[PDB]
Amino acid sequence: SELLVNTKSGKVMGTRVPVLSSHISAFLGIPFAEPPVGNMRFRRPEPKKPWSGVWNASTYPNNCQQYVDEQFPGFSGSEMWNPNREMSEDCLYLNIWVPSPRPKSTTVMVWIYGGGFYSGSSTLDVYNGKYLAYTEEVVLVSLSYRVGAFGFLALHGSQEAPGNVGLLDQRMALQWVHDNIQFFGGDPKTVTIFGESAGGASVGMHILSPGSRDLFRRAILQSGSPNCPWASVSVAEGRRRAVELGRNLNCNLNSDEELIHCLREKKPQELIDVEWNVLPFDSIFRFSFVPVIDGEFFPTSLESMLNSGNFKKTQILLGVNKDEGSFFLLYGAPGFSKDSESKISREDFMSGVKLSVPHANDLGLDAVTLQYTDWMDDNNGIKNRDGLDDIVGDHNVICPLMHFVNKYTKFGNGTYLYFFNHRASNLVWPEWMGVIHGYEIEFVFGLPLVKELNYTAEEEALSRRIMHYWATFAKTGNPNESKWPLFTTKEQKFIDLNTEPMKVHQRLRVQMCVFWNQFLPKLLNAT
Amino acid sequence: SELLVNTKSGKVMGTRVPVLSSHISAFLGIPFAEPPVGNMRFRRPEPKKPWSGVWNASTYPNNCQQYVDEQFPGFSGSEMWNPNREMSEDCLYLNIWVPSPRPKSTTVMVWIYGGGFYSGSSTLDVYNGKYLAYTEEVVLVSLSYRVGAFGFLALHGSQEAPGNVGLLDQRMALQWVHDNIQFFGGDPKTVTIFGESAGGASVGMHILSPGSRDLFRRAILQSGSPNCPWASVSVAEGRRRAVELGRNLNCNLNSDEELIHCLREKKPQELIDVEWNVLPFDSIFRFSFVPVIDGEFFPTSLESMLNSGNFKKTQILLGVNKDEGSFFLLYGAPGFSKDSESKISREDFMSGVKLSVPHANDLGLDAVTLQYTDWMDDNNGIKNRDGLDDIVGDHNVICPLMHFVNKYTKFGNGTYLYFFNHRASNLVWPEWMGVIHGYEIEFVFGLPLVKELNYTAEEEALSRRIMHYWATFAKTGNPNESKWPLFTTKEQKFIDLNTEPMKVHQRLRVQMCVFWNQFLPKLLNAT
Ligand SMILES: *[C@]([C])(=O)O[C][C][N+]([C])([C])[C]
Numbered sequence A, B: 001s002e003l004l005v006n007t008k009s010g011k012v013m014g015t016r017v018p019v020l021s022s023h024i025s026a027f028l029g030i031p032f033a034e035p036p037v038g039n040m041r042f043r044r045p046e047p048k049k050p051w052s053g054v055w056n057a058s059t060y061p062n063n064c065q066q067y068v069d070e071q072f073p074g075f076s077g078s079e080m081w082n083p084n085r086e087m088s089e090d091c092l093y094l095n096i097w098v099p100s101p102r103p104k105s106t107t108v109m110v111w112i113y114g115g116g117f118y119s120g121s122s123t124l125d126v127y128n129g130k131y132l133a134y135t136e137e138v139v140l141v142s143l144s145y146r147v148g149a150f151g152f153l154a155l156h157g158s159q160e161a162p163g164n165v166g167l168l169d170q171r172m173a174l175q176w177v178h179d180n181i182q183f184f185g186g187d188p189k190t191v192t193i194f195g196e197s198a199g200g201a202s203v204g205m206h207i208l209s210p211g212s213r214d215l216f217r218r219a220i221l222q223s224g225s226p227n228c229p230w231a232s233v234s235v236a237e238g239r240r241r242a243v244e245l246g247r248n249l250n251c252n253l254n255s256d257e258e259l260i261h262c263l264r265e266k267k268p269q270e271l272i273d274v275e276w277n278v279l280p281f282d283s284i285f286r287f288s289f290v291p292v293i294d295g296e297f298f299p300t301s302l303e304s305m306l307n308s309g310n311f312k313k314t315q316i317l318l319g320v321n322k323d324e325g326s327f328f329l330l331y332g333a334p335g336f337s338k339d340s341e342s343k344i345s346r347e348d349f350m351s352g353v354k355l356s357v358p359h360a361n362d363l364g365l366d367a368v369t370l371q372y373t374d375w376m377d378d379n380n381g382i383k384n385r386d387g388l389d390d391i392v393g394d395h396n397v398i399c400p401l402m403h404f405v406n407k408y409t410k411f412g413n414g415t416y417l418y419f420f421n422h423r424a425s426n427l428v429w430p431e432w433m434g435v436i437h438g439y440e441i442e443f444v445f446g447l448p449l450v451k452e453l454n455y456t457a458e459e460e461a462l463s464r465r466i467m468h469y470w471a472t473f474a475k476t477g478n479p480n481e482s483k484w485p486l487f488t489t490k491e492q493k494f495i496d497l498n499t500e501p502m503k504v505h506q507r508l509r510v511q512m513c514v515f516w517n518q519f520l521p522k523l524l525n526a527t
């Protein structure tokens, strides 16, 4: 049967889902690891002991324990990102959408969800891979990984909580995809892993980590790169926060064993409740438990790896949205509110920059302010708001990504860069927030095709183009069958991705990125 | 006789000069100090022992010994600034142009010439005060002062070469004007001292130095302020350069006395020949012998004086030209030539910034470059040239002046600010040089009125407006009888001064000046 599939783990029974006046198969909730519960919490993922009998993959799996957002209870704009299933430590499962008739060998697209590494669900509605599968004839897999303490608590040195385990959960699902995707119609020699934010960052880490490079062919990174400042921590830092979390739970802190054991008796939500109390700064766009540069998953500093070509050479397609920071200002900067134009006074501006660049000394915060301030109109609220928006985004997404793209390209085999700048017509977030972080996702997965969603004709157009660019890149290493230029260090071309006739530009935010990538760090090192 | 005048020093016999189809009196070469020759070299000025008999002031006096510019022999554009009279250590003389009929009590305008303190002549043709005298009915005095080692060599502590003696020569002429200008038709209670560059800097120093404040009423500062980085040196620095000059002349350097004595046997040109060998840096816009912050002429650091209101409160009219730096790049930066468009490569750009900000460490030169570079078009030669032009000017003239104007205004009684941006139609300097340093002078003195000079009708217009603004400011403390706004720290208004209908703007180069006046020094202090 088109829904019964055999895999090296056991048989799996999917279900067929209807899609745009048609249908496809969906094998949802196939497990790829032993449930990381009990004494296995914090431990590296374990392969799923095979099973016998048909595994019933007719419905979405639980979501990993995580911080649920209640900032705007009921507001769809934010709840659309909250776990829509029971959360459980038993969440390591993958979902596959397969065109019907089942292909014999098509390109595979594996989606790694975002969420600052503290959250994420492969079950969100915007991550519904059927329109892409259907529309582009690709096998869409979306995996899940442990987030939060559960996936990133790092007591480097113990094997009980080595850290990066949430990155190994992804590898592991990449492995299950390598080994079994052939029985679903997918070609394991043509899987493109793609992700947004912590997911696009994950993608780039699999591109760097030796033990993952072989499990996929191409990569698409959306609004994130392995080198984003919020993407990783030193082992010492990860240890500090690990201990600190212990303190907030009154754990014996005399040893990693007593520590890990205490943290394992704790119910999930107890860890979640104090999760944010461990950051070392009053900051915006920093999450507590993130990958640690351990010397195992990552051999040395991501930067020396970037510098020495020590990474998987292949083709990559990446980009950023216009207003990446708005979302984080709205949530943790004073002066911003969901319901006002959030015009910002210098007093609140000056506070926003301090939160955005937590590690800067005063001369540093002075350099940022000098660069992002219109001294000829310094008390404009609109300008202070937008200026703060560019600081949060340039510093945390746009510039670290530009650094990666320029370093990778030196050794890669084809880089394609976009700048997404389209505000969905039906966005329920305030206009001041612009083209928000995470809002390209819905175009990439084809929601603009389902009319009951109220997108506009041209937006439908744009979706289809984006799904084609993405699918067509997955299959061939090139987005084009109107050419989206190849990005080269010399010319630096990239393209806009909005409902207008595309246009090519060069040097995405150079002025600013020279500041953040070259000047600032030099400044902060001198002082 | 209209040409015979009595003064407390002796009688003086002028001559009448023809002016625009009319005439006026001119008393040229009246001495105000004992000739600073022989053992008096480097010494403070001595009052002119009175004389008996008519002193014959019918012709211009010698010019002070100084470095003559031979960079472009015969090129008028540069020779127009060279001494046009025999140079001599006997040069302390003043010149007075008086309307005919001799007024009983008109406003007095005393011109202090510029020249980096290393040069200057009160006899240049552009400093010809008859059109202003005639046209505006003001008594125009133009004084002279010792420049170079002769006027600024400072061996602080000896009374034989105290330094600042060239500033005392000016004071002294201000004194002779105070005491005698009444016998020429001038009102000694309404003298406006005005100067350009080292002269506008001098003006502001008389505004600060306690012993000069009383000798004048109002001040006009053109392209210079007391706080310009090239305008003064510490006593230690002045001593260093004093000694160093001695080294270049093989003077016994065992003591100030042996040193001063050696320097006094030296013929004038021997001091001039090695004058430039003493700067402590490879730099552009730095001169060797300049006023020293001695604790006598200047009580404390010009900056604490600026900060504490310790200065003459009155009305001041000041401003800068659009392209102040071009002239110094042309002469000491590689890549610039008088006969080419001087497009500049980054390699030469990067060398120009090093020369422009000699005291900056690397992080400093990195901050300047980041600010003055168009990263989206970094290999443009036009942009690198102009960018270097703005660096030289912003750093050396425009921003220190903006600092003074903002500090003074806090305690002053009326500040008027202009931005001169008109390139004379008949300028013989390359277009790339723009509105050059020193090129407002000719409009201020009314040369555009003499038709045999080929200026355009609208330029004639502009001259007359400028002479009126200047004269009308001198007489009343206000440029207006189309209003030139008063500059306030709050609004910061200023006006353009060109042949188009004037316009008011605010915040002259704020972006940049916050960089130079606030950020840079903070940066260079941290590192
Ligand atoms: C990145 C940092 O993982 O952020 C994702 C943001 N979100 C779409 C609002 C959840």
Ligand SMILES: *[C@]([C])(=O)O[C][C][N+]([C])([C])[C]
Binding pocket: B081, B114, B115, B116, B117, B196, B197, B198, B199, B327, B437, B438
């Ligand atoms: C200032 C520094 O005194 O410069 C005057 C420049 N000049 C008009 C070219 C002689």
